[PDB]
Scaffold this active site. Structure first.
Site, PDB file in Angstrom:
ATOM      1  N   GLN A 170       0.825  -1.204   0.000  1.00 48.67           N
ATOM      2  CA  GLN A 170       0.000   0.000   0.000  1.00 48.67           C
ATOM      3  C   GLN A 170       0.859   1.253   0.000  1.00 48.67           C
ATOM      4  O   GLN A 170       0.575   2.213  -0.732  1.00 48.67           O
ATOM      5  CB  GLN A 170      -0.933   0.000   1.209  1.00 48.67           C
ATOM      6  CG  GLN A 170      -1.963   1.112   1.190  1.00 48.67           C
ATOM      7  CD  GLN A 170      -3.048   0.924   2.229  1.00 48.67           C
ATOM      8  OE1 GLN A 170      -2.979   0.017   3.058  1.00 48.67           O
ATOM      9  NE2 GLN A 170      -4.063   1.779   2.187  1.00 48.67           N
ATOM     10  N   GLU A 211      -3.885  -6.914  -1.855  1.00 46.15           N
ATOM     11  CA  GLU A 211      -5.307  -6.687  -1.668  1.00 46.15           C
ATOM     12  C   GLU A 211      -5.834  -5.782  -2.774  1.00 46.15           C
ATOM     13  O   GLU A 211      -5.085  -4.974  -3.330  1.00 46.15           O
ATOM     14  CB  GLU A 211      -5.591  -6.078  -0.286  1.00 46.15           C
ATOM     15  CG  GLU A 211      -5.359  -4.595  -0.168  1.00 46.15           C
ATOM     16  CD  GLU A 211      -6.315  -3.955   0.809  1.00 46.15           C
ATOM     17  OE1 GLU A 211      -7.174  -4.678   1.350  1.00 46.15           O
ATOM     18  OE2 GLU A 211      -6.195  -2.739   1.054  1.00 46.15           O
ATOM     19  N   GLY A 262       2.561  -6.856   5.754  1.00 47.95           N
ATOM     20  CA  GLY A 262       2.887  -8.228   5.408  1.00 47.95           C
ATOM     21  C   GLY A 262       3.405  -8.380   3.993  1.00 47.95           C
ATOM     22  O   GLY A 262       4.426  -9.027   3.763  1.00 47.95           O
ATOM     23  N   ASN A 269       3.954  11.822   0.901  1.00 44.67           N
ATOM     24  CA  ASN A 269       4.341  11.219  -0.365  1.00 44.67           C
ATOM     25  C   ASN A 269       4.849  12.261  -1.346  1.00 44.67           C
ATOM     26  O   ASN A 269       5.671  11.941  -2.209  1.00 44.67           O
ATOM     27  CB  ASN A 269       3.163  10.460  -0.962  1.00 44.67           C
ATOM     28  CG  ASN A 269       2.836   9.207  -0.198  1.00 44.67           C
ATOM     29  OD1 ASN A 269       3.362   8.974   0.887  1.00 44.67           O
ATOM     30  ND2 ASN A 269       1.957   8.392  -0.756  1.00 44.67           N
ATOM     31  N   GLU A 286      27.374   5.506  -9.113  1.00 46.35           N
ATOM     32  CA  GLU A 286      28.337   6.415  -8.498  1.00 46.35           C
ATOM     33  C   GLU A 286      28.050   6.601  -7.014  1.00 46.35           C
ATOM     34  O   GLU A 286      28.947   6.455  -6.171  1.00 46.35           O
ATOM     35  CB  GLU A 286      28.319   7.765  -9.214  1.00 46.35           C
ATOM     36  CG  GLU A 286      28.579   7.694 -10.705  1.00 46.35           C
ATOM     37  CD  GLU A 286      28.975   9.033 -11.290  1.00 46.35           C
ATOM     38  OE1 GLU A 286      29.046  10.017 -10.525  1.00 46.35           O
ATOM     39  OE2 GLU A 286      29.219   9.101 -12.513  1.00 46.35           O
TER      40      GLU A 286
END
Ligand SMILES: Nc1nc2c(ncn2[C@@H]2O[C@H](COP(=O)(O)OP(=O)(O)OP(=O)(O)O)[C@@H](O)[C@H]2O)c(=O)[nH]1
Ligand SMILES: Nc1nc2c(ncn2[C@@H]2O[C@H](COP(=O)(O)OP(=O)(O)O)[C@@H](O)[C@H]2O)c(=O)[nH]1
Ligand SMILES: Nc1nc2c(ncn2[C@@H]2O[C@H](COP(=O)(O)OP(=O)(O)O)[C@@H](O)[C@H]2O)c(=O)[nH]1
Ligand SMILES: [Mg+2]
Lengths: 428, 441, 116, 49, 53, 44, 430
Positions: B11, B71, B144, B228, B254
C-alpha cells in the site's frame, strides 16, 4: 608532417575537450559548420596538425571522444561547436564504472578497448608523420582515471617513440567531491610514472582561487574554468602551428624539461589574467608579464613553489616582442630568487618566441615548470590513501572486481619511492 | 539510454508510486492520458522521458513501473483514478487476500503465488529496455506484503539479475508511534534476509516527516499524501542527473559506490533542504550556505536519530538549481571546519558532490514554495545503531514469551529462524560498533 | 543449441547488446576439425546403441520453480574482504549447501572474490 | 530523387495493402507456358505496357 | 591545375547534395510510417468502441 | 558586444528554463546509432 | 566476342539476380522496356558480353531463370524490370524440394535438368566465343543448393575449359533459417570443391552488419541486401566491359588467385560504402578508399582474415585515378602488416583499374581475397553436420529418396580433407 591526435576520456575530459576544440577553432577561424572564414593567410598554413581535411572546404577535429556513459556526449553534441565532430569517432558503451577505478580499468573498460584502439589506429595512420597523441582526463573519475590508463599503457607498446602528454586533473585535499578519490588517484599515478612522456597537474581548486581573487568573476561557471585550461593547451603547441623568432615544439620542451625519466610532472602557467577594471590601470609590457607569472597566485596547482626548489623552467612567449628584455628579465628572476633555483643546473630556464598573438590580444605567454614543491601533493594524497587503507575500507568494491590486494601495496610503494627520490634532488 | 524500473510493493508502494508518477508526468510534460498536448510528430524531439516512460506505436507513453499489492482496493483506486489510462492494465498486479501483517503469510503461503507473474512482467519490462541503470523498489518493513513478498522478490531478483542495482526505499518503523503490534517481527525477519541481497537502503520514518511538516511547512494536520509529495521530491532529486544535464551529473552506481564502505552495512539516511512554506520563504534569503547548513541539522533528518550521537562515514550530496561550484566549495569548507560534525578516522574526504541545473518543479496542491535552489543528502553515519538497538529491545521483550509466534509458525516458517535473525542483527550492531571505534593511540 | 562465434561481429551478438539483461549462455570462441568421417551412434528413431557410453542426469533439463527452489537463496555477489575466518567459512557453507541450485539451468552460479 | 546506388533506395511498400500475387506461368496441354499476358501484378495492379 | 581543383570541388558538391536529398527522403518516409500507425490506431478505436458497446 | 574570446570573458542567461537533455547517442538492435542533433538543450 | 551466360537457381538466385540485371541495365542505359536510351557511346560498345540483340532495337539478358517452384517467378515478373527477360528462359516444375537437398538433386531436379540444358546450350551456341557462365544460389535451400549443383556438374563435363563462377550464399552460424541447413551445406560444398573455378562466399549476417555499420540504415530490406551483393558482381566484370589503363578479366583474376586447384573460396568487399552521416565529413581520395577496403568489418563473410594468412589479394578499381597512389597504398598495407600475408609469395596483391566508375559515383573499388581464415567456416559446418549426423537425425527424409548413407561420409571426409590441407598452407615455412 607533425600531427597531434587528441584523446579524450570521461565527463571531465569531454567538458575540457569541448572548450579546447572551441578555442583553437577561433585561432584558425573555423565556423560551427566546419568551413573556414578567416582572413589572414597564415591562419590556414599548418591547420593539418589538429584538423583533418574533408571535401567541401571542411575540416574535422582529430579527436577520439570516449566515455562509458553516453549521457556526457549528448550535452557535448548539443553545444554550438558540437556538430563539428565526425560521428564515427564517438566511442561509448552502455554502463559506467560509478567512480570505481577497477571497473573502469579491468572489467568494463575491456569491452571498449577494442573499438577505441581502432578509432585511433585509423587516425594514427591517416597522418604521415604523427608528432604525438595527447590526453585529458581526471584522476578522480571512473572512466578518465579508469580505462583512461588502459589506453595509455596499450598505445605505449604500439607507438613508443611518439610523445604522450596528459593534462590530467589531480584531486584537491581541501574540497573533494569523491569519497573514493584516494584509491583512483593512487592507482593512476602508478600508471602515470611508468607510461607518460609529460604531465600537467591542474587542480580545479586553484582555478577557483584564480577566478575569485584575480578576475573577480561573481559567477564562475565550469565553462570559465575550462577556458583557463584550454588557453594553456594552445600555448604549448602554438610554436608548432605558427612561426616565431625562436621556434619550439613539444619535444623541444619535453627534452629540455625532464632531467631523469621519473620526473614528468609540471606546473603550468598563463600570464595575462586581469580583472575587468584592472586593464585600465595596467601597462602591456614584458616585465609586467613576467611579474604576473611567477607569482604563486597565478599557478593552477595546489602547491606553492616557494616551499621547494624550481628544478627546471620553461617559458613560451606569445607575440612580437624584443628579446633583449626577455633574456634580461629571465636573468633578473634567476639571480634575485637564487635560493629557490637549483644549483647543479645553471641557466635553468628555456625560452621560445611565437610571433602571432592570440586573437583579440596583443601579448601573452605561458609557462611550464618542474619543482620539488609538487611532492607536497603526492605526499599529501598518500596519507589520505593510507588512512583509508589501514582499515580495509571501501575495499569490497575493488576486491569484488577480481584484483588482488598487492596492487594497493605496490602503488603505495611506487608513490612513496617517487617522493623519496624526488626528495633527494631537493637536498643535493 | 538511462533507465530505472519501479517495483513498488504494498500500500505504501502504491501510494508512493501515485505521488512519484504524478510528479514525473507533470515534470516531463505528459498528460494524464499519456499523449502530449499536441501532435509534435514531424520529427523525433525531446526524448528525456525515455528513462521513465516508454514510447508506443500510437504516440503514447507507458510508465516503467509494476504496482504490486496483495489486496484489491488500493490498486482499484488507481484503476479508477484520474490517471486510469496512463497505466497499461497488465502492469498493476493484485491479489485476492493479503498477508494481514504477517511476514510468514507474505513470504511462504500467499507471496509465492504471484512471484512468477510479477517476475514475467519485470522480464518484459526489462526486455523493452536498452541501458538498464537500476531497479527502484519502494516498500515498508511493517506490512505483510511489503515485508515478506518484497523480501522474496529481492531474493529471486538476485537469481534473475546478478549485477543490476536493486535500490531500496524503506518505511522504517517509527521509534515510538506505530500502526501495528506485530511490526517488529516483520522488521527483524526482513533485514536479516535482505542483508546479503540488497545494495543500498534509504530508510525513513513517518514520524520525523510529521515533525518536519509541522515545524517548517506550517501544516498542523498532515496526511500520507503530504508525506508522499516529499518522498517523490527525494526520488526526483535522485534521478534528476539521469533525466537532465548538469554541471556534474551522477548516475546510480556512483552514489552506490561512494556511500557504502563495508559489505554488510548499507543504510544511509536521506535529507532534503530547504522545505519551507511560501510565507516562510517570502522573508528568508536562501543560498548554498543556508541550505547545506540546514542539511546537517538533527531537527531536519527524516529518521529519528541525532547524528551528533555518532560519526559520519560518507555523504552523498546532490545540488539542484542555480547553484555554483565556487559556493559549493565554500560551503564544504565551512561544514568541514566544525567539531559538532565528526568524521571517522579513515575518511579524510567523505563527500560525493553532484550538480544539476533544473530547479525542482512544483505540483499544484502541494506545500513547498517554488525555490531556485535545493539540495539532497544521503549520509551514511553510525548514529543509526541506536535504532537497531531499540528495535532489538522491543523484539526481545516481545519474544521472551513467544507472543504472536503461533501465527507465524503455522504458515510454514519455523521458530528457529526467529532466533537466527535476532542473532544476525546482534552481529550487525557489533559490526557498527567496530566501525565506529577509532584507532588513535 | 550451440552458440557459435561471429568473430568480428561478436559484439553485435553480445548478450547485453541484444537487450537480454540477465547473465547468459556461454559463447564458444574456438573450433577444431576432425579427420575422416563419423561413426553412427544411434539406432533408427534416435535410440542410442548399447555399446556407446551414455551420460547421466535427467533428460528433461533442470528447471526449478517457485516451490522447487530452496527457501533461503544465497546471493551471487560474494565479496570476502573484511569478514572473519568463521564468517567466511559459514557463508561459503551456505553457498555450497545446495548443489542442485548450482546445477539447475535457471539457477545461479555465484562469484566469490577475496580472502578473509 | 537519388542516383541508383547501394543505400539510395526506399521501399515504396510502406502504406500499401493487399499484397496479392497473380497466377502467371502454368502448365496447360502438358506444356510449360506463360499462361495469359493480361494478368495484373502484385496488388491486383496493372504492369507496364 | 586550377581546372583539376575545380573538378574536385564539383565532385564534392555533388556528393554533399546527394546526402542532403537522402536525409530529407528518410525523414519523409518516417512521417509516412507514423501516419500509417495512426490510421491503424483510429481503426482500432472505432472497433474498440463497437466491442465495448 | 562582440568582445574577444579570452579566458573568463563570457556571460550566461539568468532566465532560461527546461534544460532538457535529449538522447542523440543511442543503441538499436546490436548496434550503436548516433542521431543527428536537432533540438538542442531545452528544446530550442 | 567475350560473352557470359548468367545462370540462376532458387529463391535466393532469382531474387539476387533480379536486382543484378537491373543494376547492369542502369549501367548500360536500358529502360524497363529493353531499348537503348543512354547518352555515352561506350555505354553500348561491349554490351554483347551479356545482352542479346532482338529485332526492333531491343536487348534480352542472357539469363536462365531456374527454380523447382513457379512461386517466385510471379514476383520476378511483377518487379520493376519484370518483363525484360524473354519468357522462354523461365524453366520451372510442379513440386519443390522443401529445403531438401535430396529431392532437388536426385528425384525432382533430374526431370528438370534436361530442359534447362536445352536453353543453356541454345544460349551457349548463339555467342561466338563465350568466356564462361555464372551461377547465383544459396547453400541453405533445396533447389539452388540441390539441382543448382547438378547443373554445375553436368555443364563442366560438356564445357571443361570455360570459367564457372558461383556467387554462393553460405549459411550463417549465429542465426539460421533452415534446420537441415548443415545437411545440404556439407553436401553441396563437395560439389563445389570438385567442379568450380571460383566461389565467392557471401554470408547474410555480414550483410546485415554492413548496412548498419557503414551505411546506418534503420530498415535494410532484402532489396538493399541484394543490391549490395549485385554491386560486387558488376565490379568483377567491369574491367571486362569498359576500357581501362590497366585491364583484367575473369580469367586474369582466375590465374592469380588459385595457387592450387583445391582453393577457390574468397571473401569480397565493396569500397565506397559511405554512410549518410559521413558524406558530410569525408574526402574522396584513394588512401581513404583502401583504408575502408582492408578493414575486416567490410568483409561480407563470417570469417575474420585477421585470424589467418592472406594468400592472394585482388583489388579491381573503378574510376580514373593516379596509379602511383594505387601502387604505393597497396605497398603500405603489404608491409605494415607483415604477419597476415604468406611469406613464400612475394607481392600477394594484384591490382587492376577500370576507367569508367559506377554510374553516379566518382571513385570505387572491389576486393577479392583468398584467405586461410575461410577454413573456420568449413570446420563449423562439419561439426554442425556431424552432431546432427551422429544420431541419424533428420536422415529418414534423405535416405527415403534412395540415397545411401555413404555419401555423407565422403562429403564430410573430403570437407575435412580441405581444412587439413588449408591448415598446412597457413603454417608453412619459407
Ligand atoms: N510513508 C508512508 N507510509 C505508509 C504509507 N502507506 C502505508 N504506510 C506504512 O506501511 C505500514 C504497513 O504496511 P502497508 O503498506 O500499510 O500494508 P502492506 O505493505 O500492503 O501490508 P499488508 O497490509 O499486510 O498487505 C504502516 O506502518 C504504514 O506506516 C504511505 O502512503 N506513506
Ligand atoms: N577541470 C575540470 N574538471 C572537471 C570538469 N568536469 C568535471 N570535472 C572533474 O571531474 C571529476 C569527476 O570526473 P568523472 O565525471 O567521474 O570522470 P569520468 O568517470 O571519467 O567520467 C570531478 O572531481 C570534477 O571536479 C571540467 O569541466 N573541468
Ligand atoms: N542475400 C539474400 N539471400 C536470400 C534472399 N532470399 C533468400 N535468401 C537465402 O536463401 C536461403 C533460403 O533459400 P531457398 O529459398 O530455400 O533456396 P532454394 O531452395 O534453392 O529455392 C536463406 O538462407 C536465405 O538466407 C535474398 O534476397 N538475398
Ligand atoms: Mg496491506
Amino acid at each position: 608532417m607533425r600531427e597531434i591526435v587528441h584523446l579524450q576520456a570521461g565527463q571531465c575530459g569531454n567538458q575540457i575537450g569541448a572548450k579546447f576544440w572551441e578555442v583553437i577553432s577561433d585561432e584558425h577561424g573555423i565556423d560551427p559548420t566546419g568551413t573556414y572564414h578567416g582572413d589572414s593567410d597564415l591562419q590556414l598554413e599548418r591547420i593539418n596538425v589538429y584538423y583533418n581535411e574533408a571535401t567541401g572546404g571542411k575540416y574535422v577535429p582529430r579527436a577520439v571522444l570516449v566515455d562509458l556513459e553516453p549521457g556526457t556526449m549528448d550535452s557535448v553534441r548539443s553545444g554550438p561547436f558540437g556538430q563539428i565532430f565526425r560521428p564515427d569517432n564517438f566511442v561509448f558503451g552502455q554502463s559506467g564504472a560509478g567512480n570505481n577505478w577497477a571497473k573502469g580499468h579491468y572489467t568494463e573498460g575491456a569491452e571498449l578497448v577494442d573499438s577505441v584502439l581502432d578509432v585511433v589506429r585509423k587516425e594514427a595512420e591517416s597522418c604521415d608523420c604523427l608528432q604525438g597523441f595527447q590526453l585529458t582526463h581526471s584522476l578522480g573519475g571512473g572512466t578518465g582515471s579508469g580505462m583512461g590508463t588502459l589506453l595509455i599503457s596499450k598505445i605505449r607498446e604500439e607507438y613508443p617513440d611518439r610523445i604522450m602528454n596528459t593534462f590530467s586533473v589531480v584531486p584537491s585535499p581541501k574540497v573533494s567531491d569523491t569519497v573514493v578519490e584516494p584509491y583512483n588517484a593512487t592507482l593512476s599515478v602508478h600508471q602515470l610514472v611508468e607510461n607518460t612522456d609529460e604531465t600537467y597537474c591542474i587542480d580545479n581548486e586553484a582555478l577557483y582561487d584564480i577566478c575569485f581573487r584575480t578576475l573577480k568573476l561573481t559567477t564562475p561557471t565550469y565553462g570559465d574554468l575550462n577556458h583557463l585550461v584550454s588557453a594553456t593547451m594552445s600555448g604549448v603547441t602554438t610554436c608548432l602551428r605558427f612561426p616565431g623568432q625562436l621556434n619550439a615544439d613539444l619535444r623541444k620542451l619535453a627534452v629540455n624539461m625532464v632531467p631523469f625519466p621519473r620526473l614528468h610532472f609540471f606546473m603550468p602557467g598563463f600570464a595575462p589574467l586581469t580583472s575587468r577594471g584592472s586593464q585600465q590601470y595596467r601597462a602591456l609590457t614584458v616585465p609586467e608579464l613576467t611579474q604576473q607569472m611567477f607569482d604563486a597566485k597565478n599557478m593552477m596547482a595546489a602547491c606553492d613553489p616557494r616551499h621547494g626548489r624550481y628544478l627546471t623552467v620553461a617559458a613560451v612567449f606569445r607575440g612580437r616582442m624584443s628579446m633583449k628584455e626577455v633574456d634580461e628579465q629571465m636573468l633578473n628572476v634567476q639571480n634575485k630568487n637564487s635560493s629557490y633555483f637549483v644549483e647543479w643546473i645553471p641557466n635553468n630556464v628555456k625560452t621560445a618566441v611565437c610571433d602571432i598573438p592570440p586573437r583579440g590580444l596583443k601579448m601573452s605567454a605561458t609557462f611550464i615548470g618542474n619543482s620539488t614543491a609538487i611532492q607536497e601533493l603526492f605526499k599529501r594524497i598518500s596519507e589520505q590513501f593510507t588512512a583509508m587503507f589501514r582499515r580495509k575500507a571501501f575495499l569490497h568494491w575493488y576486491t569484488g572486481e577480481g584484483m588482488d590486494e598487492m596492487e594497493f601495496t605496490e602503488a603505495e610503494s611506487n608513490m612513496n619511492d617517487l617522493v623519496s627520490e624526488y626528495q633527494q634532488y631537493q637536498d643535493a | 539510454m538511462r533507465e530505472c524500473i519501479s517495483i513498488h510493493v504494498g500500500q505504501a508502494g502504491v501510494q508512493i508510486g501515485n505521488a512519484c508518477w504524478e510528479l514525473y508526468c507533470l515534470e516531463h510534460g505528459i498528460q494524464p492520458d499519456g499523449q502530449m498536448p499536441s501532435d509534435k510528430t514531424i520529427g523525433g524531439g525531446d526524448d528525456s522521458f525515455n528513462t521513465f516512460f516508454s514510447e508506443t506505436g500510437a504516440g503514447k507513453h507507458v510508465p516503467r513501473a509494476v504496482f504490486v499489492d496483495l489486496e484489491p482496493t488500493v490498486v482499484d483506486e488507481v484503476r479508477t483514478g484520474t490517471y486510469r489510462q496512463l497505466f497499461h492494465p497488465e502492469q498493476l498486479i493484485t491479489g485476492k487476500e493479503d498477508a494481514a501483517n504477517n511476514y510468514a503469510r507474505g513470504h511462504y503461503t500467499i507471496g509465492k503465488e504471484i512471484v512468477d507473474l510479477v517476475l514475467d512482467r519485470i522480464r518484459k519490462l526489462a526486455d523493452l529496455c536498452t541501458g538498464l541503470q537500476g531497479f527502484l523498489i519502494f516498500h515498508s518493513f511493517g506490512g505483510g506484503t511489503g515485508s515478506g513478498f518484497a523480501s522474496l522478490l529481492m531474493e529471486r531478483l538476485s537469481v534473475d539479475y546478478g549485477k543490476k542495482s536493486k535500490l531500496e526505499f524503506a518505511i522504517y518503523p517509527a521509534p515510538q508511534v506505530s500502526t501495528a503490534v506485530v511490526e517488529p517481527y516483520n522488521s527483524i525477519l526482513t533485514t536479516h534476509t535482505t542483508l546479503e541481497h540488497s545494495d543500498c537502503a534509504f530508510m525513513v520514518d513517518n514520524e520525523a516527516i510529521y515533525d518536519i511538516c509541522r515545524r517548517n511547512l506550517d501544516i498542523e494536520r498532515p496526511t500520507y499524501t503530504n508525506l508522499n509529495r516529499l518522498i517523490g521530491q527525494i526520488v526526483s532529486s535522485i534521478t534528476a542527473s539521469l533525466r537532465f544535464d548538469g554541471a556534474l551529473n551522477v548516475d546510480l552506481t556512483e552514489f552506490q559506490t561512494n556511500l557504502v564502505p563495508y559489505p554488510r552495512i548499507h543504510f544511509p539516511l536521506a535529507t532534503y533542504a530547504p522545505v519551507i512554506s511560501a510565507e516562510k520563504a517570502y522573508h528568508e534569503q536562501l543560498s548554498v550556505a543556508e541550505i547545506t547548513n540546514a542539511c546537517f541539522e538533527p531537527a531536519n533528518q527524516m529518521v529519528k536519530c541525532d547524528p551528533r550521537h555518532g560519526k559520519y562515514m560518507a555523504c552523498c550530496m546532490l545540488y539542484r538549481g542555480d547553484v555554483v561550484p565556487k559556493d559549493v566549495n565554500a560551503a564544504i569548507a565551512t561544514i568541514k571546519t566544525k567539531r559538532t560534525i565528526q568524521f571517522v578516522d579513515w575518511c579524510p574526504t567523505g563527500f560525493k558532490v553532484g550538480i544539476n541545473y533544473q530547479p525542482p518543479t512544483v505540483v499544484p496542491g502541494g506545500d513547498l514554495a517554488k525555490v531556485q535552489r535545493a539540495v539532497c543528502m544521503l549520509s551514511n553515519t553510525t548514529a543509526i545503531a541506536e535504532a537497531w538497538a531499540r528495535l532489538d529491545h522491543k523484539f526481545d521483550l516481545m519474544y521472551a514469551k513467544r507472543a504472536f509466534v503461533h501465527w507465524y509458525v503455522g504458515e510454514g516458517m519455523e521458530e528457529g529462524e526467529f532466533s537466527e535473525a535476532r542473532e544476525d542483527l546482534a552481529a550487525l550492531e557489533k559490526d557498527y560498533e567496530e566501525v565506529g571505534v577509532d584507532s588513535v593511540e | 543449441a550451440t552458440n557459435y562465434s561471429a568473430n568480428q561481429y561478436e559484439k553485435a551478438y553480445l548478450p547485453t547488446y541484444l537487450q537480454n539483461w540477465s547473465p547468459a549462455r556461454p559463447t564458444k570462441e574456438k573450433i577444431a576439425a576432425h579427420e575422416g568421417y563419423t561413426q553412427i551412434i544411434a539406432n533408427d528413431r534416435g535410440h542410442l546403441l548399447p555399446s556407446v557410453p551414455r551420460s547421466k542426469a535427467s533428460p528433461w533439463g533442470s528447471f526449478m520453480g517457485t516451490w522447487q527452489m530452496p527457501l533461503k537463496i544465497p546471493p551471487a555477489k560474494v565479496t570476502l574482504t573484511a569478514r572473519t575466518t568463521t564468517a567466511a567459512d559459514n557463508l561459503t557453507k551456505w553457498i555450497h549447501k545446495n548443489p542442485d541450485l548450482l546445477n539447475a539451468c535457471n539457477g545461479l552460479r555465484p562469484e566469490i572474490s577475496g580472502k578473509p | 530523387a537519388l542516383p541508383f546506388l547501394p543505400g539510395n533506395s526506399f521501399n515504396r511498400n510502406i502504406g500499401k495493402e493487399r499484397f496479392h500475387k497473380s497466377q502467371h506461368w502454368g502448365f496447360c496441354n502438358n506444356v510449360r507456358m506463360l499462361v495469359s499476358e493480361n494478368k495484373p501484378g502484385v496488388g491486383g495492379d496493372l504492369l507496364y505496357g | 591545375e586550377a581546372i583539376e581543383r575545380n573538378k574536385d570541388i564539383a565532385y564534392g558538391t555533388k556528393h554533399a547534395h546527394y546526402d542532403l536529398v537522402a536525409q530529407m527522403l528518410e525523414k519523409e518516409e518516417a512521417e509516412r510510417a507514423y501516419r500509417l500507425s495512426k490510421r491503424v490506431q483510429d481503426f482500432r478505436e472505432q472497433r474498440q468502441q463497437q466491442y465495448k458497446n | 558586444h562582440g568582445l574577444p574570446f579570452l579566458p573568463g570573458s563570457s556571460f550566461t542567461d539568468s532566465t532560461k528554463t527546461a534544460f532538457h537533455r535529449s538522447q542523440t547517442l543511442n543503441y538499436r538492435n546490436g548496434y550503436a546509432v548516433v542521431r543527428r542533433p536537432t533540438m538542442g538543450i531545452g528544446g530550442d
